[PDB]
Amino acid sequence: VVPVDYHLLMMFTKAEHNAPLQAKARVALSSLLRLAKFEAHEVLNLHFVSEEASREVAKALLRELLPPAAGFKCKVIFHDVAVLTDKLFPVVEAMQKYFSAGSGTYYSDSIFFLSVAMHQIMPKEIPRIIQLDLDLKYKTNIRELFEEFDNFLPGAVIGIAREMQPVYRHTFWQFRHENPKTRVGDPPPEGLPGFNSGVMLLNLEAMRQSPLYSHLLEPSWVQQLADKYHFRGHLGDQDFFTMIGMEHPELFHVLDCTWNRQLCTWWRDHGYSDVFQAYFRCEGHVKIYHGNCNTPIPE
Amino acid sequence: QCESNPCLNGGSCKDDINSYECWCPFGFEGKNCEL
Numbered sequence A: 001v002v003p004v005d006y007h008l009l010m011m012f013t014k015a016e017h018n019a020p021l022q023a024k025a026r027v028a029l030s031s032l033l034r035l036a037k038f039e040a041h042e043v044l045n046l047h048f049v050s051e052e053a054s055r056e057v058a059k060a061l062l063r064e065l066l067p068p069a070a071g072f073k074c075k076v077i078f079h080d081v082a083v084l085t086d087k088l089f090p091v092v093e094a095m096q097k098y099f100s101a102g103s104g105t106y107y108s109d110s111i112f113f114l115s116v117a118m119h120q121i122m123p124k125e126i127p128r129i130i131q132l133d134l135d136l137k138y139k140t141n142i143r144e145l146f147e148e149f150d151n152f153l154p155g156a157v158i159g160i161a162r163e164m165q166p167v168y169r170h171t172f173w174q175f176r177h178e179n180p181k182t183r184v185g186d187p188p189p190e191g192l193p194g195f196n197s198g199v200m201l202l203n204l205e206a207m208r209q210s211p212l213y214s215h216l217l218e219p220s221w222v223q224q225l226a227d228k229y230h231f232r233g234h235l236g237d238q239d240f241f242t243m244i245g246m247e248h249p250e251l252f253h254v255l256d257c258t259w260n261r262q263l264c265t266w267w268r269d270h271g272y273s274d275v276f277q278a279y280f281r282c283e284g285h286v287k288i289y290h291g292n293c294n295t296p297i298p299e
Numbered sequence B: 001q002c003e004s005n006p007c008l009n010g011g012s013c014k015d016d017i018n019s020y021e022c023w024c025p026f027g028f029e030g031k032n033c034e035l
Ligand SMILES: O=c1ccn([C@@H]2O[C@H](COP(=O)(O)OP(=O)(O)O)[C@@H](O)[C@H]2O)c(=O)[nH]1
Pocket: A010, A011, A012, A013, A014, A015, A021, A132, A133, A134, A135, A198, A291, A292, A293, A294
């Protein structure tokens, strides 16, 4: 049997003496592994981006959870946050001033853009990868998410779920003001509410092979679009994808909300009580919960 | 990370050094859109 690889990537940094992060990672990784099922020839590759202290914390957590109940093959890989930061920076520098907390351009923010240049960072042998937050709880076999790659329409490079709060309604205020009739920042099903980065299907091949996507990474394109949209953010990759998602929705396969059911309600209590429901509504059988903004996940 | 700017104008982080005005979403008032 020719072995078939599946690749996941999670950020796991500054985890030493950070108990809330470790407990989050524990909830994510146990549900993931408890519920995952893979055929005998298949291998689940778990990529962690970590400085050396967090690598050790991750190893201690992983040993307690591996091998997985289901008995499938699993490989753990660590990538140095510092090595990735230096590889990312040339590509990512120019977008940092628009999407980082706050300004200007710091190395410490570069890693929050890893997904945007993932196709240039991972070895070419990896054709696809799913990048996942650690404040998640899995309610299904992660293997099922991979089939959504098959639903990418021509030109689509990334699979991503919508943002479930009106944060982008707020961020795009001036563009909305100047364009009363825009769908930019509006709720679904017909509005463009932007994206959440907690669950992302990164088709590295399609990213590498897309002329449009490559252009959008260029400093002058980043700058032209940020100017056009009067866009400032501090959520990194999420903000960049949201923005180029306004201009070029063909790039994105929108995942159903049940693949990244966000629980954060912070924006409800900060000016958006009326419209909040229209953003936050998600129905159907939930596959992944996302306890964003430190929101306890139900049990 | 930074706390989101509750204001509609200026940078994405609250207490943007380069901002002097704060325009609050409807129904809120104050230097940080409190009440
Ligand atoms: O100190 C940190 C903060 C964040 N993260 C990772 O970055 C993701 C994004 O942060 P978080 O989920 O807290 O942000 P939110 O989902 O609220 O935007 C987390 O899930 C973690 O994987 C990390 O490794 N160390």
